Design a protein around this ligand. Structure first.
Ligand SMILES: Cc1cc2nc3c(=O)[nH]c(=O)nc-3n(C[C@H](O)[C@H](O)[C@H](O)COP(=O)(O)O)c2cc1C
Ligand code: SF4
Ligand code: SF4
Ligand code: SF4
Ligand code: FES
Ligand code: FES
Ligand SMILES: [Zn+2]
Lengths: 210, 263, 22, 87, 426, 106, 80, 83, 47
């Protein structure tokens, strides 16, 4: 965790919120109590990443100024959490869940599939910088155990082949039907509803007086 | 009024409401082994080396951070509060690099002594250690920070006693390194105090790097003449030439701190 | 389908509704 | 951890009381260390009397003087602490 | 016992099947007595919670009523606040992802119903940043509700004024912790605080605050509607109500279904969800509450029932009630080993016992999977485990120690053999 | 073996010497390494206890086999770093063999 | 941060010449009472030693850290 | 002259000591002898220098060779290692 | 030494010497530390 200034990643890279982004930043600040703008660090820093995936040291510095917070503070938040890249990242940035729940449902296979599918090893990115493979931890969506988070979307309940299919979709074209590419709807009993089979209830039902 | 009575091993000391468990032991005279707690620095609870055992309580409490309550008996030397130290010292030492004959805070270590007094005689960490890249924080403080026990007293002093607010924690897990994210020197007066306040010898003084070793230093108590605050100071002399000037506490004038100029 | 700014921009839209600050 | 027999810490303790009772005019304190060693403490005037009783008493014959020493506690008003160890 | 009726279930929109938007919610009649309830007052609402017997529903199951009550004390000039943690990080938990995504509204009225109970000025919902799409769903739902005037000034016809906000998480399991959610909300690093300044007393921004699992906030409006008794009836004694159960790993149909808490475990997998993959005989072990809780081996599973009292008798925690099941086809030594890897990549490092201790167990656990370590090392990890258990500033160190303790407690012979296997081939 | 003197001036050889014989003062060498500017064993003061051999962490100071170093003048007996380092170079082969034989015991 | 060496009073004689030695550069001292520091439990007893031994004395009052109020809650103050 | 540039001034009289005698110095100087040893190109971020010979060497220490620019140097041997 | 020779380490001497005490090769002890208190040399330029 040390930013050794590099021509690419260093403040020479000027950063400034697009006019629109600044508007967004203002709203973010409004949510928090007045006199507590500092609380908007995480949200604002994220917006910066939205603007530039790299989130260079310059960006961190801008965040600090915008929120009038000590520069170090921005650094601490950035280096603490993990959803912040702090480096250049692939256009797609797929992340494979490898906690025990997923692994127990064979997550490792998916990762291996990706490694050669992508041709790139985990912790590394494709030459075109289209895809960055990362072994991320529990991303929620454990029920659909085999699961990976490509960018923001959550592709779930995927069998090795499915991903290859998805990756191809990503490689040519866009928006490859993000979601559980399986028969189940969300996290329902795969075979058939074990409950909630009957219609939902109605307003006022079994309500105690007042 | 405003005088609770808490028992430290049944000594019925009486303390103002608000006193911490560590403070209650101090007035009886007992001293909780402590790291990350400095009197003039905010309580942080990072080390948890001060765990004590209030009587009739399921878990041990954090001395430096637990408001004492009426009736409590501290059981500072209880078999439990010794396992709670024999097992913490196991951890601080596990990731520690044993270069005590490099660490010029050799005899000035609150971690060997608190280990020689309150910890175990051996080690069980058969696994490998960690190493953290050093930092050129400045021309006065040599940060061989692979020594750091992540006690966050620097980050406090550098924010609370001095208003630098630069030093900060970076990352999570066992590679939380407490060094400036970008390499910006810690340039401020009051800077050298970090040396005196880091109990570990991670960051120490670069001029007084390896000129001496504390048992030898004869210590004469004198007065700061560089500035008109007249801060109290102790001049450490070996075989007749001054080796170091470090602060000695004067409540009213310099309360444990001295300027970068006068040291 | 949602855009990278959905969360933030939607929120800004909600700003008007957002009750007065402390 | 050294092995400690409380037989001695009891025997010696009792003797201490016996000496004290027999020589109450001089014995000020009589303690047994955790190391099973008795250490009657006597007013300086009781030097002659307390020793003689120990050298010549059937229930306490302390014939030889192992050592006579004087620790010096400068803080203590009475600087020296003459200590006589007998066998 | 078990066998809750769909009619008596709380989130009918579970599994979707009904518009998660307001309309579907109106047919659900989720916003039916909200004005009335708030009109009843903070006390009455909190009272219903006590009568309910509703426990935490999140990680440690503290009585909800008493907890919320701790901030029902008079305001000292600082605005009180509501924080609804939706981090949902505990490995195996997709429990919350449902309410948020499928039934966002239930939580919205949960927030204001809960809000007047604590007299909170406003509520901030910390949905994990990972779930970006999930966030998209709730503020659409929150936006609908204000447009309606259900929330905001003149909330649902009540003079009560409550504002609900959504905060972005940033991929941290620890953010979930009660004192650490706050600091992330405060904008500092997500590092828990010590409990002596309790969360109600020192709040976010120094203003009294309270933190609830999203499930806990969501059920409060329906429990007030159905009354504490109806709810309290479903559970067993202290353990009460019906808690959603998420079964993942080595089960024929992994799914999240809400069932009467105190439902027998052998039955949970048997009736809802699906049969243990390979037959109930193929059950090496199951971790009832998620990664933090100790796994229980099959002998106990047939008998044990999912309620917090029964589990604590069993030495395990109901926790998030995430059932992870391990067939006889899994290297548990490696299964638990990745959970310790799950915790070294995640603990904040603020406290000495967790920082070095969790890394120390990770190193020993990796050697244990290989079998390189000798048999005597196994009981050492035990001793390393309890040093971490009682000394940590937060509960995660509590949580890291328990799976290690479970592996040694019931699977000590298997680890010894892995010890033996490597020694033989030299 | 490389040629870097073993002593790193921790100075506990000075601390445990019973006779006050060893005098060590140090400063960071240009390389940046820790080294002793002056290491003086007063052999007339030394009572050859062998604790220094014991205490050294890098085992830089050793009790060498030679016993025949009788000297015409008292000053020759006082030894600075250069004499001891030279003594070390002359007897290193046997010192290494001796330490080789007895280290398992220690 | 240990305070076990700030407990007992000590009386120390005034420091004197420490000239360098020409042959070996060792420090050399002509003052016999230099390294002597006697330890006395209480201020009254130490003053007595100086008076009967005839050495001049200049006692310095003990200065103990003043009580300081600390509470973890403060660090999370609405407005500090 | 000596390891530390200890050279009695042209006027100092301790030079009388060296009159009719050899001022003992060692040709083999460490500052130089360590330099000769080449940087060890290890392939792991952190490596350990036990000192060579284990118990017959120096206290074991781990060096972080992460800094790409510089090379890790054992506070004991002076041996340098680079990744 | 012939049977098992000793380890050579490229600093160890090749010509070992006997007692050089009466001969002029003898150790003459000297302080190896450099000066400590440097002094203000006057100005050589007449004011
Ligand atoms: C490491 C750690 C992670 C946690 N993660 C979560 C979480 O994802 N969701 C949650 O509701 N509670 C979590 N908790 C528990 C919370 O700190 C807190 O006790 C709980 O949210 C209180 O809600 P309740 O009153 O509804 O039980 C976690 C606790 C710890 C120590
Ligand atoms: S700090 Fe320096 S001295 Fe204290 S233990 Fe670590 S290394 Fe040895
Ligand atoms: S540097 Fe010294 S003070 Fe700052 S954290 Fe590391 S140890 Fe504690
Ligand atoms: S000799 Fe051994 S002990 Fe004495 S200083 Fe040099 S290294 Fe440390
Ligand atoms: S472990 Fe992969 S989804 Fe939670
Ligand atoms: S001193 Fe008690 S927490 Fe560090
Ligand atoms: Zn080395």
């Amino acid at each position: 965790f040390v930013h050794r200034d590099t021509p690419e990643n260093n403040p020479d890279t000027p950063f400034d919120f697009t006019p629109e982004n600044y508007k967004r930043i203002e709203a973010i600040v409004k949510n928090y109590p007045e006199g507590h703008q500092a609380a908007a660090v995480l949200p604002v820093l994220d917006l910066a990443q939205r603007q530039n995936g790299w989130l260079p040291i310059s960006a961190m510095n801008k965040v600090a100024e915008v929120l009038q917070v000590p520069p170090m503070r921005v650094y601490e938040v950035a280096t603490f959490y993990t959803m912040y890249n702090r480096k250049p990242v692939g256009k797609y940035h797929i992340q494979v869940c490898t906690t025990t729940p997923c692994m127990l449902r064979d997550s490792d296979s998916i990762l291996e599939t990706l490694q050669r599918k992508l041709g790139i090893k985990v912790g590394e990115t494709t030459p075109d910088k289209l895809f960055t493979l990362i072994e991320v931890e529990c991303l929620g969506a454990c029920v659909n155990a085999p699961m990976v988070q490509i960018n923001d979307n959550y592709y779930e309940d995927l069998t090795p082949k499915d991903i290859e299919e998805i990756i191809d979709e990503l490689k040519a074209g866009k928006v490859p039907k993000p979601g559980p590419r399986s028969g189940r709807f969300c996290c329902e009993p795969a075979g058939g509803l074990t409950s909630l089979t009957e219609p939902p209830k109605g307003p006022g039902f079994g309500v105690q007086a007042g | 009024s405003n005088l609770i009575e808490v028992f430290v091993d049944g000594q019925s000391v009486m303390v103002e409401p608000g006193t911490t468990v560590l403070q209650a032991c101090e007035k009886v005279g007992m001293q909780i082994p402590r790291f990350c707690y400095h009197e003039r620095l905010s309580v942080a609870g990072n080390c948890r080396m001060c765990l004590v055992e209030i009587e009739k309580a399921p878990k041990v409490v954090a001395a430096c951070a637990m408001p004492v309550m009426k009736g409590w008996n501290i059981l500072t030397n209880s078999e439990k509060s010794k396992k709670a130290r024999e097992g913490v010292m196991e951890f601080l030492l596990a990731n520690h690099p044993l270069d005590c004959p490099i660490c010029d805070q050799g005899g000035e270590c609150d971690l060997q002594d608190q280990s020689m007094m309150f910890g175990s005689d051996r080690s069980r960490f058969l696994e490998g250690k960690r190493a953290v890249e050093d930092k050129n924080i400045g021309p006065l403080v040599k940060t061989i920070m692979t020594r750091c026990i992540q006690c966050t007293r620097c980050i406090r002093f550098a924010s609370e006693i001095a208003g630098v607010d630069d030093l900060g924690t970076t990352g999570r897990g066992n590679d939380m390194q407490v060094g400036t994210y970008i390499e910006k020197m810690f340039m401020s007066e009051l800077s050298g105090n970090v040396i005196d306040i880091c109990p570990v010898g991670a960051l120490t003084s670069k001029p007084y790097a390896f000129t001496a070793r504390p048992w030898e230093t004869r210590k004469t108590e004198s007065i700061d003449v560089m500035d008109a605050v007249g801060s109290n100071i102790v001049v450490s002399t070996r075989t007749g030439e001054v080796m170091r000037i470090l602060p000695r506490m004067h409540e009213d004038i310099n309360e444990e701190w001295i300027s970068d100029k006068t040291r | 389908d949602y855009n990278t700014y959905t969360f933030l921009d939607l929120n800004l839209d909600l700003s008007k509704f957002r009750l007065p600050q402390p | 951890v050294r092995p400690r027999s409380d037989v001695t810490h009891k025997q010696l303790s009792a003797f201490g009381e016996y000496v004290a009772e027999i020589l109450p005019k001089y014995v000020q304190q009589v303690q047994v260390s955790c190391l099973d060693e008795l250490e009657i403490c006597i007013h300086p005037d009781g030097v002659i009397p307390t020793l003689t009783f120990l050298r010549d008493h059937t229930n306490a014959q302390f014939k030889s003087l192992a050592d006579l020493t004087a620790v010096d506690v400068p803080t203590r008003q009475n600087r020296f602490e003459i200590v006589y160890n007998l066998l | 016992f078990g066998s809750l009726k769909d009619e008596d279930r709380i989130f009918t929109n579970l599994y979707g099947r009904h518009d998660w938007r307001l309309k579907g919610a109106l047919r659900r009649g989720d916003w039916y007595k909200t004005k009335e309830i708030l009109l009843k007052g903070p006390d009455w609402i909190l009272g219903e919670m006590k009568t309910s017997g509703l426990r935490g529903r999140g990680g440690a199951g503290f009585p909800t009523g008493l907890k919320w009550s701790f901030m029902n004390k008079p305001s000292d000039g600082r605005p009180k606040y509501l924080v609804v943690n939706a981090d949902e990080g505990e490995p195996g938990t997709c429990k919350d992802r449902e309410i948020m995504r499928h039934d966002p509204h239930k939580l919205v009225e949960g927030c204001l119903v809960g809000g007047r109970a604590m007299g909170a000025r406003a509520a901030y919902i910390y949905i994990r940043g990972e779930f970006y799409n999930e966030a998209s769903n709730l503020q659409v739902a929150i936006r609908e509700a204000y447009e309606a005037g259900l929330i905001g000034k003149n909330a649902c016809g009540s003079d009560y004024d409550f504002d609900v906000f959504v905060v972005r998480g940033a991929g941290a399991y620890i953010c979930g912790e009660e004192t650490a959610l706050i600091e992330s909300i405060e904008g500092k690093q997500g590092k828990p605080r010590l409990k002596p300044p309790f969360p109600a007393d020192v709040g976010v921004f120094g203003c009294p605050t309270t933190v609830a699992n999203v499930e806990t906030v969501a059920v409060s409006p329906t429990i007030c509607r159905r009354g504490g008794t109806w709810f309290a009836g479903f559970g067993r004694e202290r353990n009460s109500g019906t808690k959603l159960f998420n079964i993942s790993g080595h089960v024929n149909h992994p799914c999240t279904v809400e069932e009467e808490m105190s439902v027998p475990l052998k039955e949970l997998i048997e009736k809802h969800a699906g049969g243990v993959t390979g037959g109930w005989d193929n059950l090496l072990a199951v971790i009832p509450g998620g990664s933090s809780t100790p796994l229980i081996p099959k002998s106990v599973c047939e008998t044990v029932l999912m309620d917090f009292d029964a589990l604590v008798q069993a030495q395990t925690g109901l926790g998030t009630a995430a059932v992870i099941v391990m067939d006889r086809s899994t290297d548990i030594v490696k299964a638990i080993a990745r959970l310790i890897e799950f915790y070294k990549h995640e603990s904040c490092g603020q406290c000495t016992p967790c920082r070095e201790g969790v890394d120390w167990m990770n190193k020993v656990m990796a050697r244990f999977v290989k079998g390189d370590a000798r048999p005597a090392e196994i009981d050492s990890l035990w001793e390393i485990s309890k040093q971490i258990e009682g000394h940590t500033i937060c509960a995660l160190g509590d949580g890291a120690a328990w799976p290690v303790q479970g592996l040694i407690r019931h699977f000590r012979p298997e680890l010894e053999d892995r010890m033996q296997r490597f020694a033989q081939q030299h | 073996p490389s040629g870097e003197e073993r002593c790193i001036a921790c100075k506990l050889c000075e601390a445990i010497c019973p006779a006050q014989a060893i005098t060590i003062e140090a400063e960071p060498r240009a390389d940046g390494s820790r080294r002793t500017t002056r290491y003086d064993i007063d052999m007339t003061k030394c009572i050859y206890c062998g604790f220094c051999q014991e205490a050294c962490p890098v085992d830089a100071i050793v009790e060498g086999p030679n016993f025949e170093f009788s000297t015409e003048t008292h000053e020759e007996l006082l030894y600075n770093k250069e004499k001891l380092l030279n003594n070390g170079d002359k007897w290193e082969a046997e010192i290494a063999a001796n330490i080789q034989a007895d280290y398992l015991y220690r | 941060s240990g305070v076990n060496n700030t407990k007992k009073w000590k009386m120390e004689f005034d420091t004197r010449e420490r000239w360098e030695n020409p042959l070996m550069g060792w420090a050399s001292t002509a003052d016999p009472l230099s390294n002597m520091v006697l330890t006395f439990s209480a201020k009254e007893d130490a003053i007595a030693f100086a008076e009967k031994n005839g050495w001049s004395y200049d006692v310095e009052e003990k200065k103990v850290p003043k009580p300081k109020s600390k509470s973890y809650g403060a660090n999370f103050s609405w407005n500090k | 002259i000596t390891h530390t540039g200890q050279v009695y001034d042209e006027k100092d009289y301790r030079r009388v000591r060296f009159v009719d005698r050899q001022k003992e110095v060692n040709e083999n100087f460490a500052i130089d002898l360590i330099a000769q040893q080449p940087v060890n190109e290890v392939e792991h971020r952190i490596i350990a220098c036990d000192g060579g010979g284990g118990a017959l060497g120096h206290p074991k220490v781990y060096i972080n060779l992460d800094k790409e620019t510089k090379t890790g140097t054992c506070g004991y041997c002076g041996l340098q290692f680079k990744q | 030494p012939t049977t098992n020779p000793p380890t050579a380490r490229k600093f160890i001497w090749t010509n070992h010497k006997f007692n050089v005490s009466a001969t002029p090769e003898q150790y003459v002890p000297y302080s190896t530390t450099r000066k400590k208190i440097h002094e203000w040399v006057p100005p050589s330029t007449p004011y």
